[model samples]
Target chain A: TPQNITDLCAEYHNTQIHTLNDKIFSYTESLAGKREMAIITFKNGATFQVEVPGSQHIDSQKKAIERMKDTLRIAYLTEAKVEKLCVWNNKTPHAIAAISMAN
Target chain B: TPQNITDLCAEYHNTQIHTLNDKIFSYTESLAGKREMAIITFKNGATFQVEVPGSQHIDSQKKAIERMKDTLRIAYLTEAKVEKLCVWNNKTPHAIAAISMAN
Candidate 1:
């Protein structure tokens, strides 16, 4: 189970989880151009950028990870538990949470 | 000339330049995942993220804008003057530098 989902994302910051494989996420706009931004850089470096607003950059990475899990639960006021939601546009492999973990 | 190149990027601190058009120069990696990062979020929000070791994520936005102008002249320890150097992958519109501004 990929070490039980990498021990459930390493119980929040066990040296920040790295390599579950295939993650980029990215969506675009908003470096003060105001609105529409979605960044997810997790691989144990734990990155997060918000602002969704009709997200666009060719959309559909499973509706951009369900609009980035509704702005990562209000920009990380987090209730956690967003396990295994796969998305893709950089190789055309999109699987929105089928829960497959194998290393 | 697009207000003379947006008055030359608004003299560095004039509410941080926004919109000369077509900017989203994202490279990838690094939130602490160590090495290879290049982010230029400027449209008034003035965002800068570094780390560009050997660089990847399909490279070449003109060698990722000359390794982001050599780590943005050592990460914004700038003598500033890297005027117009365009780059692309999204839409395949790599121009490198032609200095055209109009809005």
Candidate 2:
């Protein structure tokens, strides 16, 4: 397929992270014009749009992707670097990534 | 005992990590002549070669020990820096190495 389905899913999954904000996103799950969206609510009462998979128009989909990327960047920048990968998971709040020094 | 068996084992173990290179030496384990040895390749590519007490002659043993020390220096430099230890292996790696890093 021309579309990167796996990468799209990975990107979508990575975008739901938000901090003190309510975020929203729009997307098309099956076809165009069918909008599937999600909102990310952080612990500090902030929310933001996370995904918009279905949209009738191309511009809307682009905007959704941009918003998702922006939110993910924020999450990445705000998180701390952990040394151990064993503790990295969904429950590891504010953990962007871990640095492994040993093999 | 007159010899440091544990450290000798560690030094010998550390000297064998030749990443795609096989340069042989007196300290290194090679398919040599009449050397009674035990070679064990463990999980994750870790390897070792144990030997009988008097397998090496006098000049051979002195040369081996000196070679062992030099090879140990090389091996120690190549090892990845470990940041943490597990709950059980916590006796070393961090606590012992961090004698200078305490706040």
Candidate 3:
């Protein structure tokens, strides 16, 4: 009967996380074909998206994944608030046509 | 050929994470019964754990889960490095018999 978010600086340790600025509301990932997309939602009704960069189906994408990880890492380090997030794209098909909508 | 942890402060956003003091090496979770555990291994041969507090299987365990989350959150905020760690336990059958060994 007593559960509240409590001004959460929400962090997740899907592998162990440490900080937050605009508290993370939820995060989801979807993989279709060579595409792996990560969408993070914030309490401020804002959202951020990250897609594996470069052409990394495996090894190549491996670096791409790190790039994406760095982007998220910096966001946490800076403790950037929501309402101010920029989105970017990598390759074509950015994702499947239907998936694009979800993106 | 160019892959290294770069001293990763691995923040897994199984949801989203931001920092690391001890640089998490790996994090795992297993549910065998009413027991839920999180085992976090550090790069310096260090490890830490958090088990849901309280005794609620359905509801009580929920509070326990929150308590555990708080412990992890603080760990990150403090940026406590490895090379030093501690352990603890709760109720009998701290976990499944075989699981204790793993713990």
The best candidate by DockQ is 3
- lDDT digits (tens) for residues B17-36 of candidate 1: 33334343332334456544
The better candidate by DockQ, 1 or 2, is: 1
Q: What is the TM-score of each candidate against the true structure?
A: 0.23, 0.18, 0.26
- The per-model DockQ list reads 0.03, 0.01, 0.03
lDDT of 3 by residue, B34-63 (tens): 222444544554444444333434665555
Q: Point out where model 1 deviates above 4 Å.
A: A1-31, A41-43, A46-71, A89-103, B1-103
Q: What are the lDDT figures for the candidates, one per model?
A: 0.32, 0.25, 0.33
TM-score of chain B of each: 0.31, 0.25, 0.36
- Report the Cα lDDT for residue B24, model 1: 34
Q: Candidate 3: where are CA atoms >4 Å away?
A: A1-20, A55-61, A64-103, B1-78, B81-103
- Pairwise DockQ winner, candidates 1 and 3: 3
- Which pairs in model 3 have colliding backbones? A13-A16, A18-B18, A56-A60, A56-A61, B13-B16, B53-B64, B56-B60, B56-B61
TM-score: model 3 vs. ground truth: 0.26
User: What residue runs in model 2 are displaced by over 4 Å at the alpha carbon?
Assistant: A1-39, A60-67, A73-103, B1-103
